[PDB]
Amino acid sequence: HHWGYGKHNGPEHWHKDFPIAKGERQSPVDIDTHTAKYDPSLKPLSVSYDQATSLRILNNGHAFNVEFDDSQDKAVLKGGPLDGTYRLIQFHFHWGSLDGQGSEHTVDKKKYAAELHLVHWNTKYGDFGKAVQQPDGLAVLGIFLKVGSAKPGLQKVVDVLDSIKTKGKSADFTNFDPRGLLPESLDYWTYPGSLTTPPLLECVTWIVLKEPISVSSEQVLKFRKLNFNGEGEPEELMVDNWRPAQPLKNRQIKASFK
């Protein structure tokens, strides 16, 4: 009876194994666009993905992770609200059963069809496992997905999902360029928060881009054919793997743009 997204093991149950679920800096949150203050001191974000080395894609029973070689400063995030250099380790998505839900962060209570998280760790802590124990350990770049025109840079991900249908399956996923998943603008909101899955650690600087990317209905429908279960187990479609908005408490959301 491990955590998941169902009626019996979903977000409202997580607190019983992970009491930090009811903590002071939990994610995601609703972004109230009228309350978020423009902070002219915020720098443009620097996304340096030219040398990114993707290695593998994994169905981990909750989502799929595209994994990167983070043994050197190749793909890094810096600038924005960040001090120092943060290395890309993996990306994944959260998505719904229907286009009207799926995102974790919301914008004035609007839910997007899905949300991409590019997860990076602060090199001053030397490895990911150490970084998640620190308040400034991770920087997660959040990008909304809406359903419309296809995102060509996503299709290589969509087309491999067939080979990692079930929990514990993996596939070789080299030479994927995550710049193909970015929107045009790097305007963002930022706030201090947490991992949105257990262990729900309060170690993330969230950077949520204002501009969504568009993907096609066929693309997101392929996400929805994945499975939470393992091979030859009762099929449970991998949908609605998102945590709802959590209380903002004593936090300010800052906008990079006016």
Under DSSP, is residue 232 helix (H, G, I), strand (E, B) or coil? coil
Q: How far is the CB of 91 from Zn ion (least distance, A)?
A: 9
Query: Which residue is catalytic, options 1, 13, 62, 105?
Result: 62
Binds 132, which of ligand 4KD, Zn ion, none (CB < 5 to 8 A, cut-off by type)? ligand 4KD
β-bridge mates for residue 48, sequence order:
76
Is 92 assigned to a binding site?
yes
Binding site for ligand 4KD (CB under 6 A): 90, 117, 119, 129, 132, 140, 195-197, 199
Is 1 assigned to a binding site?
no
* Residue 222 within binding range of Zn ion, rule CB under 5 A: no
Per the document, the length of the chain is: 258
Residue 1 designated active-site: no
Q: How far is the CB of 105 from ligand 4KD (least distance, A)?
A: 11
Is 35 assigned to a binding site?
no
Q: Residues with Cβ < 8 Å from 244, sequence gap 6 or more?
A: 11, 28, 104
Using DSSP bridges, classify how beta strands 54-59 and 76-79 pair: parallel, antiparallel or unpaired: unpaired
Handedness of CA 84, 154, 202, 167 (dihedral sign): negative
Q: Which residue is nearest to ligand 4KD (CB)?
A: 117
Is 94 assigned to a binding site?
yes
β-bridge mates for residue 142, sequence order:
117, 208
- Specify the stretch interacting with Zn ion by CB under 5 A; choose among 10-18, 38-46, 109-117, 174-182: 109-117
Q: What string of DSSP letters covers 89-130?
A: EEEEEEE-SSTT---SSEETTBPPSEEEEEEEEEGGGSSHHH
Choosing from 25, 87, 105, 117, the residue that interacts with Zn ion (CB under 5 A) is 117
β-bridge mates for residue 214, sequence order:
146
Read off the amino acid at residue 106: T
Residues annotated as part of the active site: 62
Residue ranges of the annotated binding site for substrate are: 196-197
Residue ranges of the annotated binding site are: 92, 94, 117, 196-197
Q: Which residues bind Zn ion (CB under 5 A)?
A: 117
